[PDB]
């Protein structure tokens, strides 16, 4: 059975290096918000290292015709055929893949705001005899891009990624496509509930340490905090509707680590880089009673938002996700009898604003980092960053009808919210306590040490503003 790529699929852009003699697959990433430029994800250690794969996501917004855009330019899911061009939005950051003007040493190849120009489309090829024009784009064919904006091929310089001249064949894989409405699916963002109870970990600044798992009712279930993101054992149709028993690992979206059976602290969250499959990798059990080949495609539909009570188990220990009797969770031998949890799909806003903090989180303590040494320094990102941030949280115009403002006055302080919770807030001081200890702008030694430091009182007040 072979697969075509439709319109609306999520797809991860592929590519392969021979690297320490060892044939490596790296995917197209991005993040929007604090970076545009795009870079590489390996994939290839997946197994030891998740990962971060949200970032490697990207839906087949359009597809046209060199006649049907020239035309859509001046002014039902289509399948992808050969010399057509495509838009591909960044499924995290909602930003367009777009060949840059800028380069750094062929253009710099990243994320544009709008869709509007000719900068975001990109006509793919046929790498081979194999396919002609105008035939189906196969899932599993190599295939060159070209950016419609500079006639450049998308391209991995040897590693990042830009808009050359010489060649490099791509592979689309389908992350996922239509699927049945209701279900459970791959690279979801979710809440597990039990019974007002939801699965979380502490908030910002905890004893806790964010290391360990509880059931938390109250306000919780509408902080980020109680987050997680399923991701299957599988990079091509990670995406598929989720099966009972199959295995996948729980990352939480804004502390980013990965909930783990451990030797020594026993049910625990943990660093990406210590996500192996037998700690991290999880089921859902239609049953705690004792107990198949993967599918290519979205597959059967099993698990039903809400609907559908699972028991959650750790694959390697068979050990069941419970409560010790804000109530700990452990993975134990038998577990509970009220056990069954069920999961209630994030809405995008809620969920993006979740990733954002994630990001800005690692970004800063980047920043922090450096700084400590000194008792590089990520600039151009921490700035654009924090103009990105104080954008997010612009109050909306005066000018703007009433009715609707209301409304769009909900969402800001609804996000700072969110933001706060995570201890955004401490997050912008810590900065900004660690910038003063400097007492000058050319006591710094730099350039932009004055713009750094005053965006981030910027943002406080965005972050405070009612």
Excluded at 403 to 418: G, H, M, P, T, Y
Aim: glycine share 6%; with cysteine.
């Amino acid at each position: 059975e072979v697969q075509f790529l439709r319109t609306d699929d999520e797809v991860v852009l592929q590519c392969s290096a021979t690297v320490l003699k060892e044939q490596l697959k790296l995917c197209l990433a991005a993040e929007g918000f604090g970076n545009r430029l795009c870079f590489l994800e390996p994939t290839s250690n997946a197994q030891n290292v998740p990962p971060d794969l949200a970032i490697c996501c990207f839906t087949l917004e359009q597809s046209l015709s060199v006649r049907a855009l020239q035309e859509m330019l001046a002014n039902g899911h289509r399948t992808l055929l050969y010399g057509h061009a495509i838009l591909l939005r960044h499924a995290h950051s909602r930003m367009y893949l777009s060949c840059l003007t800028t380069s750094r040493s062929a253009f710099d190849v990243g994320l544009q705001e709008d869709a509007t120009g000719e900068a975001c489309w990109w006509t793919m090829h046929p790498a081979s005899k194999q396919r002609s024009e105008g035939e189906k784009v196969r899932v599993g064919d190599d295939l060159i891009l070209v950016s419609v904006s500079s006639e450049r091929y998308l391209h991995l310089s040897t590693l990042q990624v830009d808009a050359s001249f010489m060649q490099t064949l791509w592979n689309m894989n389908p992350i996922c496509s239509c699927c049945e409405e209701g279900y459970v699916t791959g690279g979801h963002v979710l809440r597990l509930f039990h019974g007002d109870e939801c699965l979380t970990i502490s908030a910002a600044d905890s004893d806790d340490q964010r290391r360990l798992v509880y059931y938390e009712g109250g306000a919780v279930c509408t902080h980020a905090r109680s987050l997680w993101r399923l991701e299957p054992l599988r990079i091509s149709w990670s995406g598929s509707h989720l099966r009972w028993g199959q295995p996948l690992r729980i990352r939480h979206v804004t502390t980013g680590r990965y909930l783990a059976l451990t030797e020594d602290q026993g049910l625990v969250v943990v660093d990406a880089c210590k996500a192996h499959t037998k700690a991290t990798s999880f089921c859902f059990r239609v049953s705690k009673e004792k107990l198949k080949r993967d599918v290519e495609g979205m597959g059967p539909p099993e698990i039903k938002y809400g609907e559908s009570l699972c028991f959650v188990q750790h694959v390697a220990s068979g050990l069941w996700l419970t409560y010790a009797a804000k109530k700990k969770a452990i993975l134990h031998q038998e577990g509970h009898m009220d056990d069954a949890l069920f999961l209630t799909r994030c809405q995008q806003e809620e969920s993006q604003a979740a990733g954002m903090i994630h990001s800005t989180a690692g970004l800063y303590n980047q920043f922090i980092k450096g700084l400590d040494s000194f008792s590089a320094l990520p600039i151009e990102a921490v700035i654009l960053s924090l103009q990105d941030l104080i954008g997010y949280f612009e109050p909306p115009s005066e000018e703007l009808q009433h009715e609707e403002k209301q409304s769009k006055l909900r969402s800001l302080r609804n996000r700072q919210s969110l933001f706060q919770e995570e201890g955004m807030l401490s997050l912008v001081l810590n900065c900004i306590d660690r910038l003063n200890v400097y007492t000058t702008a050319a006591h710094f030694a730099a350039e932009s040490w004055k713009e750094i430091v005053n965006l981030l009182y910027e943002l406080l007040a965005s972050l405070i503003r009612g």
